[PDB]
């Protein structure tokens, strides 16, 4: 509702970034266990669904086989983790700027 929805868009984006960060950290910590499949969430589609709304995570394609059945690749996971952290901080900065502007309007 007005202020609520305008802030809610960025709040939901930030929450989705946090959940994706949690999934990435989980599948990085679990990177040395046989029989594990790397998981991730389609951020753009998930955010679009939530904006007009319990996340539907999906598997990640392997790039080179391993006998033990592990599909998590450390370099790709690290790059994705860094990208997600930067996106999270960017969203935090945008949200903080909007809130600070809204507060300063009342002064």
């Amino acid at each position: 509702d007005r202020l609520d929805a305008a802030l809610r868009f960025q709040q939901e984006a930030l929450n989705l970034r946090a959940q994706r960060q949690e999934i990435l950290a989980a599948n990085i910590a679990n990177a040395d266990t046989p029989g594990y499949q790397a998981r991730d969430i389609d951020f753009a589609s998930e955010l679009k669904k939530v904006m007009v709304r319990a996340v539907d995570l999906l598997y990640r394609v392997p790039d080179q086989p391993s006998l033990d059945g592990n599909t998590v690749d450390m370099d790709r996971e690290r790059t994705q983790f860094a990208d997600n952290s930067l996106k999270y901080q960017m969203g935090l900065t945008v949200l903080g700027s909007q809130l600070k502007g809204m507060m300063n309007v009342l002064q």
């Binding site: 080179q64 086989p65 391993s66 006998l67």
Partner: protein, 50 residues
């Protein structure tokens, strides 16, 4: 498919006959190219040796 593990493996054996020396003992025998003396193994089933 890039990773290609390597595992050691041993085929049966090499059947080249070894060098034999003459000790003149009355009951020391040496086989032919593909000979085999049959003995009774511990379990009972027959086995082959040289």
């Amino acid at each position: 498919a890039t990773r290609t593990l390597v595992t050691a493996s041993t085929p049966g054996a090499d059947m080249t006959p070894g060098q034999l020396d003459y000790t003149s003992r009355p009951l020391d025998v040496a086989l032919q190219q593909d000979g085999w003396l049959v003995v009774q193994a511990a379990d009972g089933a027959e086995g082959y040796t040289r």
